[PDB]
Amino acid sequence: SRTALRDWLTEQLADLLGEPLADVRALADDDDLLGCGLDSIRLMYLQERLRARGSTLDFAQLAQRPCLGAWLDLLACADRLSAPATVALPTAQDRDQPFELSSVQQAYWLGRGAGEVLGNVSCHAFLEFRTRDVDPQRLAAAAECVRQRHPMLRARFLDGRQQILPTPPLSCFDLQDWRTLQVDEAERDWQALRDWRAHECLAVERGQVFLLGLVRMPGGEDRLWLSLDLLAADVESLRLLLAELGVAYLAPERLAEPPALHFADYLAHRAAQRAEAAARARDYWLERLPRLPDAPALPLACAPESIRQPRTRRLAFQLSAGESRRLERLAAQHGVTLSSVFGCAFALVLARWSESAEFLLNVPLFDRHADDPRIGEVIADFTTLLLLECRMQAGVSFAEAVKSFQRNLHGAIDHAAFPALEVLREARRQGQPRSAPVVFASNLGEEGFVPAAFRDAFGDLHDMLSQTPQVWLDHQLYRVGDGILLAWDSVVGLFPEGLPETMFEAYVGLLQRLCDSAWGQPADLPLPWAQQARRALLNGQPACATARTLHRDFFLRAAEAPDADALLYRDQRVTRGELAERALRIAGGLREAGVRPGDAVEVSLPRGPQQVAAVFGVLAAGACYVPLDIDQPPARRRLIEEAAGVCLAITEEDDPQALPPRLDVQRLLRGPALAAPVPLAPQASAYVIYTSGSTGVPKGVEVSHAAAINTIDALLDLLRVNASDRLLAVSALDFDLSVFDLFGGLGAGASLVLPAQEQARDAAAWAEAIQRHAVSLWNSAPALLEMALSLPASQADYRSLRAVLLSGDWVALDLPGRLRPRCAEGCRLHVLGGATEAGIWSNLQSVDTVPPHWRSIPYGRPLPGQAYRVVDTHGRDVPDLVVGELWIGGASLARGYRNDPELSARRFVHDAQGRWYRTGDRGRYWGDGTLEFLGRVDQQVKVRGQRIELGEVEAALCAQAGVESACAAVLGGGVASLGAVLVPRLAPRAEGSMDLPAAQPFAGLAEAEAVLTREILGALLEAPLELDDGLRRRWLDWLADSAASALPSLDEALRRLGWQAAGLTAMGNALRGLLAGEQAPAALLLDPWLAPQAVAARLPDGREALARLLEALPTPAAGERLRVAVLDTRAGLWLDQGMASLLRPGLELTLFERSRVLLDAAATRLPERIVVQALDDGLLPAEHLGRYDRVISFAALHAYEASREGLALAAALLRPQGRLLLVDLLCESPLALLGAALLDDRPLRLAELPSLLADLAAAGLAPRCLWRSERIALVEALAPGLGLDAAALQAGLEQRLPQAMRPERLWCLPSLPLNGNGKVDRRRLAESMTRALG
Amino acid sequence: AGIWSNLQSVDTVPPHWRSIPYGRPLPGQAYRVVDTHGRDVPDLVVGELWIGGASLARGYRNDPELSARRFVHDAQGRWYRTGDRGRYWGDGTLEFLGRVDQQVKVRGQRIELGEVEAALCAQAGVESACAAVLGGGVASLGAVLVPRLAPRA
Amino acid sequence: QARRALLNGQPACATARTLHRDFFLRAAEAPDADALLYRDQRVTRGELAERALRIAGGLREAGVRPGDAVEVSLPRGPQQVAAVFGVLAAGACYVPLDIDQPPARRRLIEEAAGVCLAITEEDDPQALPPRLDVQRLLRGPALAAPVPLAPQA
Ligand SMILES: [N][C]([C][S])C(=O)O=P([O])([O])O[C][C]1O[C](N2[C]=NC3=C2N=[C]N=C3[N])[C]([O])[C]1[O]
Ligand SMILES: [Mg+2]
């Protein structure tokens, strides 16, 4: 009955909560029992009592709706829908034999290993207690009594299994009577002792799991300490131990009984009990293993694998009794367990400090669940490790957050049946390196951590330390007094030396806040105010900006000193006055040409004075200059123009009929000079520097005069630029560093050294110019200065160079090391940060020297007038040392993108902090407020220091005719080349028409192959130990099923196949050597007598099919050069059989295969007139696209993961109107079965030729089947005009990309490899390309 | 906010001060001037003063609700939400501008007029009450009573 | 925004510590040093510290424990300072009230506060909160040192 059931639940809740039966009964159906002080420890005990009862329920079920009514309902349903749990336990495990480890036990054991990741540690608790005076003899007696009483306390650990000794051979009590020492000496020795034994590797191997100890300090103080290996004892077990100790010290007579429930018995019973749940959980985890989050992405000073001896540091916060009370109350009001509160908080802090909000944390569960109540007296390691997946939502109230967290945890508690350890093991087995190095241990049962029994004899817990291995951060909670002890047992040196402290302080602040505030408050933690303050300081630096039009200063200068040198060129030099007059003439021409304030103007000129004048006149006319390198291709030019909405294009070409009106700059120089520059508001658009754009359409960064001038001022005031200075305009016009060159330098009065167009990348020229003109200021991407510096000092003199700006690409740490001896005394290297979209720059690290701790030259302080924010994916500012998205803000931001409002909105985001560019740069603040830039998560990459979005190069390839999809990457090596990958489009069509002259094959060939299989199976099975057990079983079954009892026949088999007794002897000897030498499976393909395609080339009359496939190469009849390619070369074995006839006059042969070594063997055995190219990592060079009139595949198309793969590869490799030649296996070859079994590959790859031709037509080819049908189907198909060609590709990339971002090396794939997420595997591709390089 | 959250040093009073302003925030703490909506107000703009930083109280002792109400959060962190009116100057100085609400000063000590009103409403025979600080040199606190008449037949 | 960020971002002078730390440090350094000055009498750092510690020990004897709210309702003087330093020293949180504070409002505060204890000139364990005589507390055993408090407390 429901009511009776309610009564029973009342009874259990009374028992568990320690409340009156009546009172409990009073609790409403709808009353939240976590509201009534229930916790997960109690509720797992209730779940166990319901399971004993037979009313089996999932803790998830109970704890998702933790109210009487819900449970009642559930139980009502369960009683008829749920099975009982009356599992018959094993009667007993021998109580003295080595028995199996618990999962958690296993984990802790594995950690002891020196070679284990962050291991080499005990997993022991060290406890510390303070008491005035206690008898050492009583303590020793109590320690030995507890060891004898509790089997587990004397448990030896070996070979991944645990054995309980009668009496351990090693000491149990460590007495250090230091009453004779000085107070200072005693304290120092104690400190040493603490720092030793708190981290001690307990001799578990000798039963030393438990080691009590005492120090008698001379100041009349006895410091009880307890080194307990949690291998042995759960921390609830530790407190039990505490209790036991206290009783044995005060009165061992009152020790009730040694618990009879032997731990091995417990383990066996528990295992048997959980088997079902275990399997369920395993299925759960397996369904979620690929989607598990990684470990918390916390800042790590030192790699955990790099820590040989991890020292633990506790961060302790004793939550007051009132605080505890408040937490409890609030948790109750919000319908959550206090442990979920703490855990939620912990998770939040992690997330905030974690690059990823989603992470794993090891939640040790209380898992004491057995039939015998006496189990709550046992001292064993009753823990079970929960692999808690936590996905902290940002922006939600802590109420929401906590609720979510609880739900997750409660759901996972059931799933914990399948241990965390095994989850992780499967992750490694599945290639997932994921782990849970962050522990959350909520030991929150209100009896107090330190039992009364213990408290009476000795003082409450003074200090403690965990040593959990493989654990970064062992978070624990203890009932200290009536309060809560917040413990962060972090690893010394693992984290930044100041990190853990900070993070713990934030944790404590959040908890306290919870205490004193409603949970409707945001879960998003505030930054540690120190951090925020620092960053505010960095961000708030006043703008140096004398808010003005970007051209103002230059013109000012020119009026002040028109005769002053402004520009320096190949030989000529241009004064301020001349440059200003030319710019004003250009501006007058533009206004005559219809240009007007703020109207976008394209500037496509070779580098030189006219370029400068054009830009200046653009600005002067009130317009916004859209710089484009003359090198800019027509197509991308058009794209830019269109996107830009460019009113006009200044060029060396007069073409009003162009897309935009295109004017000759020289004709504009003939125009009437304006009296003065058009009055522009500083806020007006200055330039539209076209960044590369991820969709393929180039993106225009519309930077205001205000913004550019802000940056320039910020840097001018710092560089102290003056008239005497001279810059070098190495920076392209369409690279915004030139904005500082032009405007900055000229406004300051500094002269500009202008490399010629031909000098755009000429380091020698640069050097010469520098030397000649005494250049005092340099400004570039570091890629250009590295190039410069490549020149010897003698060949290149930089000693005039007063200061250096390097920016917009990674400045290598040794580059200041090269530069200081080269440049002027007082070197003044500045490294500057921030994207095109923040004016020019947004940071400055001065580099008077590189300190050792820089992993890269950081972004320094933000420049004056602008700022940085490092943010989570959610937009919330990340703490210090925390990797997040760099957010540039301030006066220096671009107005947006030119004609991309959407993207502008996306990127130039808003906040209560203002406007922010949202760079997609990764980076982190440091504790000193420096800002480490950390590269990029995305497709924006640096090539030759220039900015390229790989999605642009990919889209410029996909624009190409015959391209389906493409991938681009920056490759390794010194070159640091861009490269890319192609996915052809094959134009699928209906070419399934087929005719088949199947008159040649006969069943005698099948019988003959069966006989040869019999011979080889007998040859190897006479020495069967060379195979493995599975291969032995398979070969034994085959000896009949494919050789003897299926198709028995005569020895005529050999005379039909071709290979005679000598060939069979060679095959057998090679097979025996292959298996004995451990060279399988690779060396099988190196043998002509054993490779499946090689044997298929002779056995099923494969040589005749090879001869016919060798026909239709018309080079001798054509009397002209022909190019032929092979996709299934491998070791060139069948080719070794047919090469002499294959090499027809004028025939050019190339060999392909997805292996370097096999093709090396093929080249070794085949003559020199044959080209060999490896599909390195399955990667096809683009050079071979559409280059071959004929393509050949031989008895290996099935070996490809899909016939579509090889068919697409051949179609791409075929010159238009070229013909594929293909022989493939439709029916299994019994000897090829042995070959595949040596390869251990499935014979299911094969299919009949109708499917082959269907796929081939789906590949766009038009097939014709020649002969031999079922055994060897000789198919030849024509390839249509895919349009793919190296030449063609090149042309297209020339048409659509500047030479700075064309792939220098180009590749091809039938299909892109995919990441676990289903996205393009760009890493893999990158790697592939890199390897392909050489 | 701990004890204090600003410091104006006063070596001399420049004529432009209509009141001695809150100066700079004290080290380790901060001020925000916000709209009713929580967004920061520009300079010279009258808004709610938001104190923040290391100096904030943990909250109210046993008033989580009120704590939440007052000690509000933002992307800028934790803020007390004083109900002081005030404005930032162009120089960064923070003119405090008194209060819109019932929190008022008597003998320099802090009184909420809603307390004095509720302490009168607690009185037998009181329906509703109003309190205010009065004019004159005394700057006295006074209050007004609304009797409850026990209506009957 | 920049200006205000500057204002707000001033680094914390805070040597993050328990509020009582410094005084005890001083006391240890110079116990003889004059700490308080009263009507006629003067109290040394040492004396004050001792008194505070005695108070603290009495508090902990009275069941007081870290972070637990303690009412301090004493006439202004050395005893009142001693009382709050001991409250702090005990690990507790002092809830100061004027002796002038009326019974009703006192009760209100006490209730609201969840005050563990009330330091007074009056011994009345039967009060709403356990009410202790400061003088009696002064007779309590002095603590070796202040209870170690986390600054966040
Ligand atoms: N010029 C430049 C600016 S500076 C440009 O425009 O380009 P970009 O792309 O934007 O830039 C570059 C990239 O990356 C980053 N950065 C800057 N700076 C730098 C870098 N990296 C490294 N290092 C350095 N320094 C940005 O942000 C972008 O993204
Ligand atoms: Mg960029």
Residue numbers in the entry:
A (entry chain B): 7 to 1340
B (entry chain A): 844 to 996
C (entry chain A): 538 to 690
Show passages lifted from the paper.
In conformation 1, chains A and B are identical with an r.m.s.d. of 0.037 Å. The ArCP domains of both chains bind at the donor sites of the Cy domains, with the salicyl-pPant ligands observed, representing the substrate donation states. The Acore with interrupted Asub domains (complexed with Cys-AMP and Mg2+ ligands) are in the thioester-forming conformation but without the PCP domain captured. The E domain in this conformation may represent the epimerization conformation because the low-resolution map of the PCP domain was only observed binding to the E domain in this position (described later in Fig. 5). The tunnel surface for salicyl-pPant binding was clearly identified in the A chain of conformation 1. In particular, the D240, P370 and S448 residues are in the range for hydrogen bond formation with the pPant arm atoms, and Y114 can form a polar interaction with the thioester sulfur. The residues C129, H130, A131, L236, L471, Q473, and M470 form the salicyl moiety-binding pocket, and an additional Y484 residue forms a hydrogen bond with its hydroxyl group. These interactions position the salicyl-pPant donor in place for the condensation reaction. In the thioester-forming conformation of conformation 1_chain B, the aromatic residue F741 in the A4 motif51 was observed in two side chain conformations with a rotation angle of ~68°, similar to the H207 movement of 4CBL52 crystal structures. When the side chain of F741 points toward the active site, the pantetheine tunnel is closed, whereas the tunnel is restored to the open state when this aromatic residue rotates out of the active site, making the tunnel ready for the subsequent PCP-pPant entering.
